[PDB]
mmCIF file with all atom_site columns, C-alpha atoms in Angstrom:
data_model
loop_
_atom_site.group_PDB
_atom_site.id
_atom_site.type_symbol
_atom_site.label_atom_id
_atom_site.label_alt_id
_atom_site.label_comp_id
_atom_site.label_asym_id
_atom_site.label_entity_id
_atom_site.label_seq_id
_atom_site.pdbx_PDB_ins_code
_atom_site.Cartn_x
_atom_site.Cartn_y
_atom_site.Cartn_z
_atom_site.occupancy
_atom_site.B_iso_or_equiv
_atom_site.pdbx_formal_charge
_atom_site.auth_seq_id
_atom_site.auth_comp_id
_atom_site.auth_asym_id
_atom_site.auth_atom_id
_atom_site.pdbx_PDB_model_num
ATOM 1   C CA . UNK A 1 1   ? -8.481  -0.394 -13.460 1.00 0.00 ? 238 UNK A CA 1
ATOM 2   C CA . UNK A 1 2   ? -8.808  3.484  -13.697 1.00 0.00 ? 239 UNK A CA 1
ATOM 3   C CA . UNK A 1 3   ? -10.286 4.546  -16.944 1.00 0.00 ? 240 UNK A CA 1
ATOM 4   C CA . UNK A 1 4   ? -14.280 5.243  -15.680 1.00 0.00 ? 241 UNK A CA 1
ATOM 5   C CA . UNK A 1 5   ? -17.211 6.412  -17.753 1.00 0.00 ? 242 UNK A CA 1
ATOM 6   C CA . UNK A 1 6   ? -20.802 6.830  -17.782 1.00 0.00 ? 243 UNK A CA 1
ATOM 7   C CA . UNK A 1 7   ? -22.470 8.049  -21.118 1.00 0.00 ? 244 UNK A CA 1
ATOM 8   C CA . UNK A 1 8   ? -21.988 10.862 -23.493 1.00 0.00 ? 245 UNK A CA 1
ATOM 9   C CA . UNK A 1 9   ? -24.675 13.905 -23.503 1.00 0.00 ? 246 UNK A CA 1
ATOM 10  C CA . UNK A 1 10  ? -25.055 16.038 -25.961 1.00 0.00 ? 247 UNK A CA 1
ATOM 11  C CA . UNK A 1 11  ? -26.911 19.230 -25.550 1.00 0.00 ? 248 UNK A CA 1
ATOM 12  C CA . UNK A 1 12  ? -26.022 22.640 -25.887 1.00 0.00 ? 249 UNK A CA 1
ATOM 13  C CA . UNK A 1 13  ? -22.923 24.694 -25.500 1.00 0.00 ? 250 UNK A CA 1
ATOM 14  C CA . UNK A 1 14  ? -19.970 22.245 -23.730 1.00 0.00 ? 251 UNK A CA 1
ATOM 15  C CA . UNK A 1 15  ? -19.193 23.504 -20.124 1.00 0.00 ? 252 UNK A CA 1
ATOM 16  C CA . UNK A 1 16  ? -15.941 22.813 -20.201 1.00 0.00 ? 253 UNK A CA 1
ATOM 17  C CA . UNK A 1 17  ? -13.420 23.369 -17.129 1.00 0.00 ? 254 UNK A CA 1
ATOM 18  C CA . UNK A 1 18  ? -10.691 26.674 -17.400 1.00 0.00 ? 255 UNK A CA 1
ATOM 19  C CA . UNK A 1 19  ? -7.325  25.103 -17.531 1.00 0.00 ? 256 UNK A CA 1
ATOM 20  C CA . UNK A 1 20  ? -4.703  26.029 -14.979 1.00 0.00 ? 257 UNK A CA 1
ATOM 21  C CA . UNK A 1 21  ? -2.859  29.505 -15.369 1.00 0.00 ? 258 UNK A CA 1
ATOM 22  C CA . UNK A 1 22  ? 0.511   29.255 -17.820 1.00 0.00 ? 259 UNK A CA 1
ATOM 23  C CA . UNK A 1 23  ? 3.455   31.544 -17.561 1.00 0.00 ? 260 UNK A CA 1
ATOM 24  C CA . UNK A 1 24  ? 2.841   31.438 -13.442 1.00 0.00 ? 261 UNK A CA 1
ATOM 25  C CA . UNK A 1 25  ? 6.260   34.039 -12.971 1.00 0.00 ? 262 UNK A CA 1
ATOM 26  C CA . UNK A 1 26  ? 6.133   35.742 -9.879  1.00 0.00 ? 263 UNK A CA 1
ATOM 27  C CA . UNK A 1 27  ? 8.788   38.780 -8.868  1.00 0.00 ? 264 UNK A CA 1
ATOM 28  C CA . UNK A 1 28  ? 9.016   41.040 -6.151  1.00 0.00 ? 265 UNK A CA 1
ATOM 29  C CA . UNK A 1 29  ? 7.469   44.312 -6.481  1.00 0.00 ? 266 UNK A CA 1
ATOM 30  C CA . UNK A 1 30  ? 10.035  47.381 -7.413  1.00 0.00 ? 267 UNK A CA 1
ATOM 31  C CA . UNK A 1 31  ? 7.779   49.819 -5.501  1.00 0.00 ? 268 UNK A CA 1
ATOM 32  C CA . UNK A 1 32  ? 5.507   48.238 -2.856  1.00 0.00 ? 269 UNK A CA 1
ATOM 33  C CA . UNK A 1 33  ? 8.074   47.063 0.251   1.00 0.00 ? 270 UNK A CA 1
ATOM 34  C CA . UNK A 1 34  ? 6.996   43.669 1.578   1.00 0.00 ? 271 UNK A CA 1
ATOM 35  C CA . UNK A 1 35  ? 4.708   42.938 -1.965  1.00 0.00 ? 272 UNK A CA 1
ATOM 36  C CA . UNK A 1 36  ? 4.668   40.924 -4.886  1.00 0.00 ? 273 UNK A CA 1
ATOM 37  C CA . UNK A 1 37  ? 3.662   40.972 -8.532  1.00 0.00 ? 274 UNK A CA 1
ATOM 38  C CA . UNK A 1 38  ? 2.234   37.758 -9.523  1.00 0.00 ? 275 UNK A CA 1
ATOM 39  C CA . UNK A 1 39  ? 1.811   37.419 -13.073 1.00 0.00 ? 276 UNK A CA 1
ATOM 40  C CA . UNK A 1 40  ? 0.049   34.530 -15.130 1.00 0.00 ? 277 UNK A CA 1
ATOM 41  C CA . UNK A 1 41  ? -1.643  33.312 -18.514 1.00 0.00 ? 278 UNK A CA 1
ATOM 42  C CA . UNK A 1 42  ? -4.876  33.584 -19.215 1.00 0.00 ? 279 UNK A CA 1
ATOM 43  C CA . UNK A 1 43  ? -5.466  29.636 -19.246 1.00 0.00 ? 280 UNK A CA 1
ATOM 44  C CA . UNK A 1 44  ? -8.786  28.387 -21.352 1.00 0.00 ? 281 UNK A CA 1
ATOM 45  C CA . UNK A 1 45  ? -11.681 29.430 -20.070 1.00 0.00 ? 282 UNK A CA 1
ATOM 46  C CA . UNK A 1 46  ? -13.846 26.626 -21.483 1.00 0.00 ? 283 UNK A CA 1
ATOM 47  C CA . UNK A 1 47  ? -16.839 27.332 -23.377 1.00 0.00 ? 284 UNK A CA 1
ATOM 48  C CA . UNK A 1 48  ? -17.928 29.102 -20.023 1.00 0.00 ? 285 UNK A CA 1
ATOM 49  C CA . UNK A 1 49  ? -16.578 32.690 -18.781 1.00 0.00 ? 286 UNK A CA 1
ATOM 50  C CA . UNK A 1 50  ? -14.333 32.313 -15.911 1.00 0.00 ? 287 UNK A CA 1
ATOM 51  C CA . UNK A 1 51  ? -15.999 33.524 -12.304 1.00 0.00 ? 288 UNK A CA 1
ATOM 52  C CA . UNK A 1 52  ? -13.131 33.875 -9.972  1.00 0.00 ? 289 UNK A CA 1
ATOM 53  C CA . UNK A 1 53  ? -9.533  32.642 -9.199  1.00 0.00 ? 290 UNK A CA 1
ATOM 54  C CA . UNK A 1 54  ? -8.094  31.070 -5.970  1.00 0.00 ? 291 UNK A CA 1
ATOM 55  C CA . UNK A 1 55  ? -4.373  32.171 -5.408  1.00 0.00 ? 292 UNK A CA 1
ATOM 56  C CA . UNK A 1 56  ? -2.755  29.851 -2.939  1.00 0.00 ? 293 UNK A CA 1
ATOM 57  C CA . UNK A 1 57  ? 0.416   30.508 -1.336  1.00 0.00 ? 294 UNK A CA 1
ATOM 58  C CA . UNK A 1 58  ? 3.021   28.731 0.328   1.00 0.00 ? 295 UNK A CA 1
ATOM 59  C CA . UNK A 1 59  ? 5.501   29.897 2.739   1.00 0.00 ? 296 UNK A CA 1
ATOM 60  C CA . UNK A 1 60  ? 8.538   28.302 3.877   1.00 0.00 ? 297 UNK A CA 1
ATOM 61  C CA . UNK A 1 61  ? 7.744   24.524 3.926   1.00 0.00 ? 298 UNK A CA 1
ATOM 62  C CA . UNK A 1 62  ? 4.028   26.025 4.414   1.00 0.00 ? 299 UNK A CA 1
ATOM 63  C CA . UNK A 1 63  ? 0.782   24.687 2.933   1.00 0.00 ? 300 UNK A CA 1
ATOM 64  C CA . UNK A 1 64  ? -1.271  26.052 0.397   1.00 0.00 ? 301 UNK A CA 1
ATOM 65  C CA . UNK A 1 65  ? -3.033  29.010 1.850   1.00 0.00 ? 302 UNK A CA 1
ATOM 66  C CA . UNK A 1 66  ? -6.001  30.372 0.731   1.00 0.00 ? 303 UNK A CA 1
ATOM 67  C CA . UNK A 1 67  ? -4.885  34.126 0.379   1.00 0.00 ? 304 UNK A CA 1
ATOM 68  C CA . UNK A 1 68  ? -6.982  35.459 -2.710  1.00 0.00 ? 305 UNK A CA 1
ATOM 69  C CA . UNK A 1 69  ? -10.274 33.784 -3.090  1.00 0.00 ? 306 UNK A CA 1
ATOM 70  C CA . UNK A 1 70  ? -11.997 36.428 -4.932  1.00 0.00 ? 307 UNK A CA 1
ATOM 71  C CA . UNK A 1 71  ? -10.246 37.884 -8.335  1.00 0.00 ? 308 UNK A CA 1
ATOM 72  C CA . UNK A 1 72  ? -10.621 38.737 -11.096 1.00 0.00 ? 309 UNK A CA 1
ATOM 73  C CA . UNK A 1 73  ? -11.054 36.192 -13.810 1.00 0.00 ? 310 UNK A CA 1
ATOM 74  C CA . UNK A 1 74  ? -9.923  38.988 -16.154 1.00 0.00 ? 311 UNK A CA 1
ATOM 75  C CA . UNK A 1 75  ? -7.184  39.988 -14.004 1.00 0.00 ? 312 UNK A CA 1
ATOM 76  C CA . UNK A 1 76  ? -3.679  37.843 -15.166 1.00 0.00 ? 313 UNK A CA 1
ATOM 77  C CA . UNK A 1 77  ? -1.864  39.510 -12.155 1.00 0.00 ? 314 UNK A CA 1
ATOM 78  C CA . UNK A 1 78  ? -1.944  40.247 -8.497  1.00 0.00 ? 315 UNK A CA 1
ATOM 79  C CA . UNK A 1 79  ? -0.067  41.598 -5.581  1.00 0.00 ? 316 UNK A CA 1
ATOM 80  C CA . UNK A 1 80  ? 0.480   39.753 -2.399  1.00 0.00 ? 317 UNK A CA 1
ATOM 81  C CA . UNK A 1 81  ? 0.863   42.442 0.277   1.00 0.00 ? 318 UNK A CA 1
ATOM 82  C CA . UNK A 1 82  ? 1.607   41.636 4.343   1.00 0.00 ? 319 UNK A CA 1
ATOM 83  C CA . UNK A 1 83  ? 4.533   39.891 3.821   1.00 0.00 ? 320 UNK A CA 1
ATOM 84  C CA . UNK A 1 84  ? 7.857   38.269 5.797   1.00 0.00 ? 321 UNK A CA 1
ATOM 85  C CA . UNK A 1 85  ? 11.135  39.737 4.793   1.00 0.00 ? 322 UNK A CA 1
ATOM 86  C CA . UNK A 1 86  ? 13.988  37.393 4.070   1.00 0.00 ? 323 UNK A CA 1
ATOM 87  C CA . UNK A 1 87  ? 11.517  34.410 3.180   1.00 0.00 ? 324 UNK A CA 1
ATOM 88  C CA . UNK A 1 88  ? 10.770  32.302 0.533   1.00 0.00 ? 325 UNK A CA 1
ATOM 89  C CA . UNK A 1 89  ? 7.056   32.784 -0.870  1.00 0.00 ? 326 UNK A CA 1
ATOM 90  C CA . UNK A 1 90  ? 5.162   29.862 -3.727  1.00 0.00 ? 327 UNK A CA 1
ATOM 91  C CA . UNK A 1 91  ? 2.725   31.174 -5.688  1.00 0.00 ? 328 UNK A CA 1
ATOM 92  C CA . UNK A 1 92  ? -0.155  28.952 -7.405  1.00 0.00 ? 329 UNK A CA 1
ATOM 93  C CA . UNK A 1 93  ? -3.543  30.234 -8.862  1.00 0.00 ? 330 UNK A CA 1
ATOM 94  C CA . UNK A 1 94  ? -6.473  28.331 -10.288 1.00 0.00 ? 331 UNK A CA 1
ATOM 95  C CA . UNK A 1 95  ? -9.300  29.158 -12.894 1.00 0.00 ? 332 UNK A CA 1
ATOM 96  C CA . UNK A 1 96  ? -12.765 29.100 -11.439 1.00 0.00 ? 333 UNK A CA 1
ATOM 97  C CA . UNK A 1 97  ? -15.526 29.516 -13.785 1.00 0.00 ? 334 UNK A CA 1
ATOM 98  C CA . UNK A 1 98  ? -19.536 28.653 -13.427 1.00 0.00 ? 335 UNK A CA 1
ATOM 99  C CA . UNK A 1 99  ? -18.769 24.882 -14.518 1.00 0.00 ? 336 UNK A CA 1
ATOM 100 C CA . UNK A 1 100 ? -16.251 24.450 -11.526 1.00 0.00 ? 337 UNK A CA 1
ATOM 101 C CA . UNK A 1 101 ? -12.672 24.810 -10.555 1.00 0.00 ? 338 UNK A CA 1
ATOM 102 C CA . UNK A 1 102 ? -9.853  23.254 -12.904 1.00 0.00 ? 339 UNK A CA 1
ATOM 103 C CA . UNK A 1 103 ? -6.359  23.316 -11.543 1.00 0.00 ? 340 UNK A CA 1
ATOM 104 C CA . UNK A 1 104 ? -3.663  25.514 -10.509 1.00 0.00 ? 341 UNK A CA 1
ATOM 105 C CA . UNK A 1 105 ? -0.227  26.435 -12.018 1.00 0.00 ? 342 UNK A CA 1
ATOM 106 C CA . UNK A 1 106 ? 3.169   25.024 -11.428 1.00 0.00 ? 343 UNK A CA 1
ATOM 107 C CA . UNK A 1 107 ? 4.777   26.446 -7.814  1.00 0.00 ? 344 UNK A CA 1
ATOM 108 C CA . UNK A 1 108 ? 6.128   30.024 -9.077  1.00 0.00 ? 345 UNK A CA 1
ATOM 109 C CA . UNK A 1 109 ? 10.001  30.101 -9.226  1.00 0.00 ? 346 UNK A CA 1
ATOM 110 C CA . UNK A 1 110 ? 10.953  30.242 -5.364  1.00 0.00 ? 347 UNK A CA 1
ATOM 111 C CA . UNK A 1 111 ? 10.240  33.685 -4.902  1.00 0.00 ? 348 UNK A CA 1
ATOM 112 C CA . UNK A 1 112 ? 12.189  35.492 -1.589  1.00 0.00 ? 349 UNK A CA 1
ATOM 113 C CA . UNK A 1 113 ? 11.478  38.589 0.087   1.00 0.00 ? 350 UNK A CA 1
ATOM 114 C CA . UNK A 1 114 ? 14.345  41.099 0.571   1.00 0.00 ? 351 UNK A CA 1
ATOM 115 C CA . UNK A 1 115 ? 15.665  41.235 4.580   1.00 0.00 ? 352 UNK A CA 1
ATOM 116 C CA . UNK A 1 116 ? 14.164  44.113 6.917   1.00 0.00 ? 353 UNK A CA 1
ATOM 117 C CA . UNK A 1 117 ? 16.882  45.092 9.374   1.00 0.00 ? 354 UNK A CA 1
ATOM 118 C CA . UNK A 1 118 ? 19.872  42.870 11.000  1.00 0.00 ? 355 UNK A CA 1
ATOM 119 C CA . UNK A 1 119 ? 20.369  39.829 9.919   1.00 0.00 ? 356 UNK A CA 1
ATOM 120 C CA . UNK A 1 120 ? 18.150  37.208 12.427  1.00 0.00 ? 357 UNK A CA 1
ATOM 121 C CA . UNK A 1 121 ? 19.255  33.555 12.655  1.00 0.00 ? 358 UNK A CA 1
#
């Protein structure tokens, strides 16, 4: 009471769906205050070029945020600028290609933002 089906088709190149993005590490950025360098794998694109990527992030206990919905398919990093200082920051891209969306990657190790100022709280 799961499994579902509905025939087979056969017929030119097979539009399968990119993968999620592997190696999903994510560290601060050692030049840019208040940015940071998300880095991923290229995941399998799926008999069909990727289009774009959707790079969620979540804040402190916060939900997925659309942040980046156009990138670069052929881009395996990016740089979240306009950030908080002394908070945590997840980090969770998707492959997009013509076919459709596949999933994203594993929450990026708890990344945290270095404090800005006195200590608050």
């Amino acid at each position: 009471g799961s499994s579902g089906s509905s025939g087979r088709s056969a017929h030119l190149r097979v539009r399968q769906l990119p993968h999620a993005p592997e190696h999903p590490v994510a560290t601060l950025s050692t030049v840019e205050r208040r940015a940071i360098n998300l880095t991923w794998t290229k995941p399998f694109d799926g008999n069909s070029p990727l289009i774009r990527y959707i790079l969620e992030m979540s804040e402190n206990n916060a939900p997925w945020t659309v942040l980046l919905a156009s990138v670069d398919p052929k881009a395996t990093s990016v740089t979240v600028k306009g950030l908080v200082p002394a908070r945590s920051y997840q980090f969770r891209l998707c492959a997009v290609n013509d076919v459709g969306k596949g999933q994203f990657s594993k929450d990026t190790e708890r990344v945290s933002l270095p404090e800005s100022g006195p200590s608050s709280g």
